[PDB]
Each structure stands twice: as structure tokens, then as C-alpha cells.
């Protein structure tokens, strides 16, 4: 299905499978914050899109908890991916890792947990 | 006040004084999901926008770890409000406490730490 | 009343209440690291005891997940409390802010989620 | 030595830049009302670890820790707590600490430090 906040941003689904996923975005000038480097929020969309597509294989849930370690700026123009790997999977909760990587270097650490319904 | 990601998101600044910020929002069609609620992205780009404001009122700083905690969903319509308070502030490291709200029920909570520059 | 682990640690429940809880202890030398302070793990035990002690007022459940920010640290012979009140109560989930203080300062701030069994 | 390590019984496995593993096992004393090992002795394993290796860079104090329960371990049951170095700057630094027992991954912890 079309995602509307996704489309918004212009993230692109690479790779979809089983407990992963990989989604793709460029940094805009709509994307900023007053830095003048990709917004956290934009970043962090980045990662939850992944992470929810990659949960959302294993069938419908709500997250619960997120972490956003950030590690490195980025600047407008900057192409990122964020790829998402389950760490944990139960009966009624699932854990996600998701790493935001641009050109070869970890920018940014994301961790979530769902809720399985 | 708000930075260009503010901006393309609809969020605005309500208030901003030493150690704390209050942005508002209103989810549009292009913030929803695959499922038709808030994305968690928008919830977490509405919280680290007060984060972000209320932690530079104290100089430059840069984000290093976030948590956002979802409690409730919200559909299209719904207006909310992202109110950060200082929690902690040290030479080097501040924490910033970030509730959001809507319609007088608490939606997220966010805690988020940075470096001061 | 009282854990197991808690009572090896020297923790004692001060107060516990629907949906909060205060747990009180002192620094002890077997508490400090190779620095001379409060281990990190001592801490954070203190705020674990108080946070499931007051989810466990809403009935049986169990932790998912939790964050520790550390604001100042603590020296053989303080007393410190964690204070334990509720943020969210869902129907399969529940999150708890908790409190480290000591003489009056915030040493350390802890969010916890739990899932209902 | 580590005087709360040494009272939990941690005992430190492997030192080298950067990483660090801790072992201990849960006894009588480290368990909840439930009967399982208490959420604070997982985290300390952890928090030893994260400790262990981030100061192999340089004195160090944390800042920020996440710490995700999967599993729940029972009274005799080995520990591991082995922590990495996922991200190195000026002036902090994060680790992955992954907390096993029997092959099994019990809870996985994340951890940022200020670097004095
Ligand atoms: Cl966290």
C-alpha cells in the first residue's frame, strides 16, 4: 500500500522481506532544521518507516518504544537508507533494529519495540 | 522561528523561553500512514522540534540520544501540541522532557539528550 | 513486599499506591565501581524495583523496555529514592516514570514500559 | 576490582579496545517476586560491560541507556554480557551490549557516554 508521510518525504522502499527492509531517501531543502543539516525528524522517519514495514511483515502492530541514537549530520543532497533487521520476535511483542547509513557511514542507530495484535 | 522540515510538516511555534518550547501541529492527510493514523514519524518530528528549540535556548547543542514512547493513534483532524521542559542541565549535557498532547490526553512522551556545543 | 534482590541491595519500599511506588536506599560500599561512585547498575536497580513494584498495582506484567539518563553521580553514604509514577495505562500495556533523587537533586531519570499480562 | 561487580558475582571474560565481555550467574539473591532474575542484574551485567569497554578509550561517564527484556532467566542460570563499540566520536561514544545465556539472546542493551 501507498504510504501518504512517506510519499510526503520522498522515501523509496528498496527491499522488502521477511523481518526487514530497507527504505531509501534523499535530504531536501524542505528536510532542514536550522542548522542547515537533515532534521532529526526526518531522520527518524526515515528509520520508522523501515522499521514499520519490517514489523508489518510479520503481521499487524503498534509500536510502543523507540530509541534514536544520532551520529553524524548530514547535509541537503545527502542520499541516506535506513535497513531494518529484527532482533526479537514473540508472541506478542517484536524488537527492530534499524541502521540509517549513508555512503558507507553509520549516521544514526534506531531501536523499536511493537506491539503484536 | 521554525526551521524549513517545520515548515513542510505545518508545525508552529507557540512559545519558547529558557529551558522549554511548545509546538503545535495538526495532522493533514500527507502525515497519515499505510493504516490511516498518525505516522509515528510525525509525532517524533512534532516532539524533537520542541526538543531541538528548547535545547538551543541554552546555546548551541546536538542531539545524541531519544526515546519516544506512543501511547495513543490519531487520525486526521487531530490537533496537537509537543510541550518540552528541561529535566537536566549540565556544562555539557542537558534532558529535555517532551509530552505530547491532544485534546487533553497525553499521546507520546519523548525524552531526548544533547551535547552542548 | 520487598525483593530478593532488592533486600541483597539494602532497598526498602517506602510507599506504594495504585499506580505509583517510592523505594529508598543508601550508597553501601559494595555499591560503588572502580571510580569510587554509585554503579551505574545500582541505580538503575533502585528505579527497576519502584517501576515494577508500582506496575505490579495494576496486576502481574512484565518489562519490556527501559531507559536510565544519569544527571550527577552519587558517593558511599547517600540516600536515594526512586519515585515511580504512572504515564500511560492501556489495556495490554503500561509506562512509568521514575525518579532518582537524593538530598533534593535529580540524579538520575528512568522511563520504563511494561506489558500486561 | 569492582566492588559491585565482585558482590553480584561478575566476572570479566575478555578486555580489548573498544569491547568487553562480563559472565555472571543468577543466584538466589538476583531474583524478582516472579522467581526470575531481577531486571536491575540483567542490566548490571550489562552496564559492566558498556563500563568496561567504553573506558578502554578514556575515562567516560554515561549518559544515556536503553535496556530491552526478550527473555527471562532462572536461578543458575550463565549469563554473558558482550559489549561493542557501534559508534566512536570526539566527545562520546555508543556501545551494543547483547545479553546471552545459552545461545539464547535474553535482552539487548544500548549505551551512550560523554568522553571527559
Ligand atoms: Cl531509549
Do not use: I, Q
Request: hydrophobic residues 50%; glycine residues 10%.
Amino acid at each position: 500500500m501507498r504510504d501518504p508521510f512517506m510519499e510526503a518525504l520522498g522515501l523509496k522502499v528498496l527491499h522488502l522481506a521477511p523481518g526487514e527492509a530497507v527504505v531509501a531517501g534523499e535530504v531536501r531543502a524542505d528536510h532542514l532544521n536550522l542548522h542547515g543539516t537533515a532534521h532529526g525528524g526526518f531522520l527518524y522517519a526515515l528509520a520508522d518507516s523501515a522499521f514499520a514495514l519490517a514489523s508489518n511483515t510479520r503481521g499487524p502492530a503498534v509500536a510502543l518504544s523507540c530509541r534514536m541514537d544520532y551520529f553524524r549530520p548530514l547535509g541537503a543532497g545527502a542520499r541516506v537508507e535506513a535497513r531494518a533487521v529484527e532482533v526479537n520476535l514473540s508472541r506478542r511483542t517484536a524488537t527492530y533494529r534499524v541502521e540509517v547509513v549513508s555512503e558507507g557511514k553509520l549516521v544514526a542507530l534506531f531501536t523499536g519495540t511493537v506491539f503484536r495484535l
